[PDB]
Amino acid sequence: AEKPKLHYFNARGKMESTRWLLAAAGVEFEEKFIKSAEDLDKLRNDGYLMFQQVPMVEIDGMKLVQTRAILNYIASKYNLYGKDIKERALIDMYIEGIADLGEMILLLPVCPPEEKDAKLALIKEKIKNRYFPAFEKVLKSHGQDYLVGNKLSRADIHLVELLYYVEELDSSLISSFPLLKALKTRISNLPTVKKFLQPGSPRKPPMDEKSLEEARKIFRF
Amino acid sequence: AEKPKLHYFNARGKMESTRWLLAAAGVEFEEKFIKSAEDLDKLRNDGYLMFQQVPMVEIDGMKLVQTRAILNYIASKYNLYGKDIKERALIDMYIEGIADLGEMILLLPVCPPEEKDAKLALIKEKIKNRYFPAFEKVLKSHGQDYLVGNKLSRADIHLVELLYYVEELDSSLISSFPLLKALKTRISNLPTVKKFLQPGSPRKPPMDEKSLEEARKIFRF
Numbered sequence: 272a273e274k275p276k277l278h279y280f281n282a283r284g285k286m287e288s289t290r291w292l293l294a295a296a297g298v299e300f301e302e303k304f305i306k307s308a309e310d311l312d313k314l315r316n317d318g319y320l321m322f323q324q325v326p327m328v329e330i331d332g333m334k335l336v337q338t339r340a341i342l343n344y345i346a347s348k349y350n351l352y353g354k355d356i357k358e359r360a361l362i363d364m365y366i367e368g369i370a371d372l373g374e375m376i377l378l379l380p381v382c383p384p385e386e387k388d389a390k391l392a393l394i395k396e397k398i399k400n401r402y403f404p405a406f407e408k409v410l411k412s413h414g415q416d417y418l419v420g421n422k423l424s425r426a427d428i429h430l431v432e433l434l435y436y437v438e439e440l441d442s443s444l445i446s447s448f449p450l451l452k453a454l455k456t457r458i459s460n461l462p463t464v465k466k467f468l469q470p471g472s473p474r475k476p477p478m479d480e481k482s483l484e485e486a487r488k489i490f491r492f
Numbered sequence: 493a494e495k496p497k498l499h500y501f502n503a504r505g506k507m508e509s510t511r512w513l514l515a516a517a518g519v520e521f522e523e524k525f526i527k528s529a530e531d532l533d534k535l536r537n538d539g540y541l542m543f544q545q546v547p548m549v550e551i552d553g554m555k556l557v558q559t560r561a562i563l564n565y566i567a568s569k570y571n572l573y574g575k576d577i578k579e580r581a582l583i584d585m586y587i588e589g590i591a592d593l594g595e596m597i598l599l600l601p602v603c604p605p606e607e608k609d610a611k612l613a614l615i616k617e618k619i620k621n622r623y624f625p626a627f628e629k630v631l632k633s634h635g636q637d638y639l640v641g642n643k644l645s646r647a648d649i650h651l652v653e654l655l656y657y658v659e660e661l662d663s664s665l666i667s668s669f670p671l672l673k674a675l676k677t678r679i680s681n682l683p684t685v686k687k688f689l690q691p692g693s694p695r696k697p698p699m700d701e702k703s704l705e706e707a708r709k710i711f712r713f
């Protein structure tokens with residue numbers, strides 16, 4: 272029927288976690304790229320964006336805005352949000368930790384040059400002493416293949432996506448965390464995820480200086 | 493039985509929305525205040541904070557950290573998160589908008605003096621031209637007393653809490669939004685909320701330079 276339609280600019284940004292989740296669920300989607308501020312304004316004027324911002328996803332008759340709203344709906348619709356509220360609580364706690372670290376890395380390129388060095392150092396420190404030990408500890412606690420309920424959930428998907436970004440940053444960071452390395456492997460081999468990691472998929476590359484300045488002009492940041 | 497126990501410092505911060513939610517649901521809770529950095533370190537060493545941070549809420553045998561994880565659990569447990577996946581999607585979209593504006597106002601006090609004047613102007617502009625019209629439009633669209641499903645939800649609670657903060661900032665901002673003003677009144681009269689607004693409740697006052705000074709030392713911000 273109507274495949275979900277993602278509205279954003281041709282880049283990772285705040286739309287990438289959604290592309291990863293849909294793909295891992297095996298859902299085909301279409302993207303409608305915003306190429307100019309004129310494109311954004313038309314969406315605004317047609318009353319498509321509740322808060323005049325993107326990401327925006329057309330799905331099940333709704334024009335959903337706000338990253339967490341979009342991700343929560345999709346995760347629930349495809350049974351990737353756990354089996355009950357206690358499982359959702361563990362999932363939420365884990366993925367909000369992932370969102371904090373992920374945001375830091377996302378904004379690194381937009382960080383003021385005189386601060387870049389400090390920021391990068393703080394991030395690596397947090398990765399090694401706060402975030403990775405926390406997730407490695409969860410996996411060691413139950414010895415299971417998945418983070419929550421011994422079954423695949425959005426938590427494993429979001430985590431593995433973040434592990435790829437950390438690798439791009441510094442591949443040595445994951446060294447002292449074997450369980451995390453193991454999970455990265457298992458999840459990457461699931462048919463849906465393997466197809467998404469392969470050349471030619473909707474997966475997006477890191478942002479280049481040239482494309483980054485047009486984005487900044489359109490969105491103002 | 494065991495009442496929920498909230499761990500934070502004596503101030504609004506990121507714990508205030510949880511205080512407002514529990515109270516609106518009629519749930520009594522206890523607070524354990526962090527008075528010094530040594531208090532924070534004890535929690536850390538006791539293995540109570542997954543990511544070495546607070547807010548942390550002890551509830552139903554769990555040591556839940558992360559604001560959204562805590563609020564999602566509580567909203568679900570007390571039937572304040574809608575009746576289905578689609579109602580939850582509208583709620584999430586709305587409250588994520590509230591979270592964005594709320595974060596701006598929360599951080600205003602820790603903003604550079606040089607920047608404050610430009611910041612606050614940006615906020616008031618967003619309030620009048622982005623956020624308030626969006627919510628006023630939702631209420632006008634259905635003509636109902638609540639934001640979603642013609643039944644009280646966490647969305648009405650989060651919104652009214654935000655209206656009080658905007659009032660503290662500039663009481664004239666809500667002027668051209670009659671429906672928002674009406675909602676503020678209606679929600680404030682609910683028994684549980686009215687009791688929370690009264691003197692002596694766990695509701696917290698805005699921050700003062702001395703206390704802000706110390707929060708900053710402890711939390712390093």
Ligand SMILES: N[C@@H](CCC(=O)N[C@@H](CS)C(=O)NCC(=O)O)C(=O)O
Pocket residue numbers: 284285323324325326336337338339489490491588592
């Ligand atoms: N909290 C929102 C933030 C959305 C957001 O910041 N969107 C940006 C681009 S990534 C945008 O459209 N900015 C245009 C504007 O703010 O006018 C979310 O998570 O979706």
Ligand SMILES: N[C@@H](CCC(=O)N[C@@H](CS)C(=O)NCC(=O)O)C(=O)O
Pocket residue numbers: 367371505506544545546547557558559560711712
């Ligand atoms: N995204 C987290 C942020 C938590 C947070 O920023 N906690 C601060 C105090 S408000 C803290 O404990 N900082 C100490 C630290 O980061 O080491 C949440 O929503 O709970």
Ligand SMILES: C=C(CC)C(=O)c1ccc(OCC(=O)O)c(Cl)c1Cl
Pocket residue numbers: 280282283284285286377378380476477478483486490492
């Ligand atoms: C809303 C925007 C800024 C707050 C945003 O989501 C964003 C973040 C990083 C970005 O580049 C880096 C990348 O890897 O995509 C880009 Cl192009 C965007 Cl639009």
Ligand SMILES: C=C(CC)C(=O)c1ccc(OCC(=O)O)c(Cl)c1Cl
Pocket residue numbers: 501503504505506598599601697698699703704707711713
């Ligand atoms: C994590 C902290 C900041 C990164 C935080 O949540 C926070 C924000 C504002 C604050 O003061 C303002 C207030 O009105 O409470 C305080 Cl005291 C805190 Cl601890």
